[PDB]
Amino acid sequence: AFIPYAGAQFEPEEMLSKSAEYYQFMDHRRTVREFSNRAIPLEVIENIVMTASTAPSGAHKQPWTFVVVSDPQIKAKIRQAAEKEEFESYNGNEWLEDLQPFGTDWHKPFLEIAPYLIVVFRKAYDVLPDGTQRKNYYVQESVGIACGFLLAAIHQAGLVALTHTPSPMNFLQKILQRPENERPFLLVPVGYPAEGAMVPDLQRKDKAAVMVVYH
Amino acid sequence: AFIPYAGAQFEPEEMLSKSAEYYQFMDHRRTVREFSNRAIPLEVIENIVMTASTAPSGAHKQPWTFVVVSDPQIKAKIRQAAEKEEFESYNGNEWLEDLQPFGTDWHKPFLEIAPYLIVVFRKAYDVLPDGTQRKNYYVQESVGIACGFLLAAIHQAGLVALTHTPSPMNFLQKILQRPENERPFLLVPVGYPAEGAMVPDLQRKDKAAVMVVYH
Ligand SMILES: Cc1cc2nc3c(=O)[nH]c(=O)nc-3n(C[C@H](O)[C@H](O)[C@H](O)COP(=O)(O)O)c2cc1C
Ligand SMILES: Cc1cc2nc3c(=O)[nH]c(=O)nc-3n(C[C@H](O)[C@H](O)[C@H](O)COP(=O)(O)O)c2cc1C
Ligand SMILES: N[C@@H](Cc1ccc(O)c(I)c1)C(=O)O
Ligand SMILES: N[C@@H](Cc1ccc(O)c(I)c1)C(=O)O
């Protein structure tokens, strides 16, 4: 069965102004690594997560699981395991030169200070109630896109985030007790920014370095 | 060097209402496969693309190239190559059962009818002017997220899109003449929806199937 499309449509002038304003708005977004521990209603995070879940996906499999962690003990254990992996990584060269402008150590207090950690898992396949497996398609792409929606929703809500690698992969899977068809994809602490929060003075690429037009 | 974070912040009640409204808004987004060929100013697409490019990325490499195609001859050649690949795929089983509710053939008139095709490329590495290579990190994740921003921006602008696999991979790379460090990631036709546009009557997963909360 099919149904008519019910999306809002605008005339060219509204479209120009809307697209210009959204660009300016999203250009203000920056990765923030120093959080306030100020509380946020679960309902806001739920809205944000289900917004991420409206993303398109290969064959409409929605091959993702969002684990929302506010439990300070689990956050503590996650931070501990994460800080341990990085300690080994930060001493054992191309990489280290690329990382210089961000001023990051193996320290990760944001993993406990942020009121919520959103841990994104990808699903390689679904397990029917039969025990049988049914594979999903273009999972990497689908979950990446959903993560894009997640971050867009976080910004829309006036919050900040830090997109973080899912290390330690094994530990995240264990402590959050996710099944075999799932693997950690991203780790995203969410919260208000610290009052005096600073970010690296970075510049994004210009149109010419990012965009190629075939008229 | 560092600079203060300059993002908009709201009080809990605005945050709740903003997050609820954005969820409803994004829930109206649907993949559309029947387009209007109504023209759109390049400036809107530029705004949309540079909005995608504000996404976070591993080590701030922004490992992506956005190829915007409006040239009807290139679109014609792309559609031809794409339709040929799919013809072979649609006859040569798990997949075909999963694809039934979308009612798609190997036909792809949208690849010419859509006023713009946005072809997203990922960059495995950068090539310095020395000829030397400098690898990028978590490219799949970064470009996926940027694609999420792209689609969020398209919806914000009142347009629709079809997230499409980058097939034929080799052909897209050839006709768009992209260098060796680049590979096709996604194909995204963009435009107004056809007046009587229909979409599959799908239902997205509920909170419980998508979300796990550790209180
Ligand atoms: C896939 C991915 C992984 C990332 N991993 C880390 C990380 O492990 N540690 C960190 O401090 N930042 C991480 N980041 C944040 C980037 O460093 C940041 O997005 C980049 O420096 C650009 O800053 P901006 O997002 O404010 O534009 C990651 C970003 C992405 C997209
Ligand atoms: C990575 C990816 C690849 C996709 N490839 C195709 C495709 O090749 N053909 C197609 O008709 N739709 C494709 N889609 C669209 C999905 O089928 C669509 O998002 C899904 O059916 C859910 O519909 P919705 O986006 O309206 O919620 C793709 C989506 C994603 C995320
Ligand atoms: N690319 C093919 C088949 C297809 C269709 C839908 C979809 O979500 C996925 I992943 C693949 C096509 O366009 O028909
Ligand atoms: N995960 C490490 C190192 C790091 C840092 C930034 C970055 O963009 C990437 I990819 C990796 C850390 O958190 O320090």
UniProtKB/Swiss-Prot annotation, chains A, B:
GO molecular function terms attached to this record: FMN binding; iodotyrosine deiodinase activity
Subunit structure: Homodimer.
Superkingdom, natural source: Bacteria
Binding-site residues, 3-iodo-L-tyrosine: E86, Y90, K108
Leading EC class: oxidoreductase
Organism, scientific name: Haliscomenobacter hydrossis (strain ATCC 27775 / DSM 1100 / LMG 10767 / O)
Family: Belongs to the nitroreductase family.
Function: Catalyzes the dehalogenation of halotyrosines such as 3-iodo-L-tyrosine and 3,5-diiodo-L-tyrosine. Likely to also catalyze the dehalogenation of other halotyrosines such as 3-bromo-L-tyrosine, 3-chloro-L-tyrosine and 3-iodo-L-tyrosine. Activity towards 3-iodo-L-tyrosine is much stronger than activity towards 3,5-diiodo-L-tyrosine and 2-iodophenol.
Protein name according to UniProt: Iodotyrosine deiodinase
Gene3D superfamilies given in the database record: NADH Oxidase
Disulfide bonds: none
InterPro entries: Nitroreductase, Nitroreductase-like, Nitroreductase/BluB
Residues annotated for FMN binding in this entry: R29, R30, T31, V32, R33, P56, S57, T163, H164, T165, R204
UniProt-listed PANTHER family: IODOTYROSINE DEIODINASE 1 (PTHR23026:SF90), NADPH NITROREDUCTASE (PTHR23026)
Reactions that this protein is recorded to catalyse: 2 iodide + L-tyrosine + 2 NADP(+) = 3,5-diiodo-L-tyrosine + 2 NADPH + H(+); iodide + L-tyrosine + NADP(+) = 3-iodo-L-tyrosine + NADPH; 3-iodo-L-tyrosine + iodide + NADP(+) = 3,5-diiodo-L-tyrosine + NADPH + H(+); L-tyrosine + chloride + NADP(+) = 3-chloro-L-tyrosine + NADPH
Needed cofactors: FMN
Pfam families from the UniProt entry: Nitroreductase
EC number, as in UniProt: 1.21.1.1
Keywords annotated in UniProt: Flavoprotein, FMN, NADP, Nucleotide-binding, Oxidoreductase
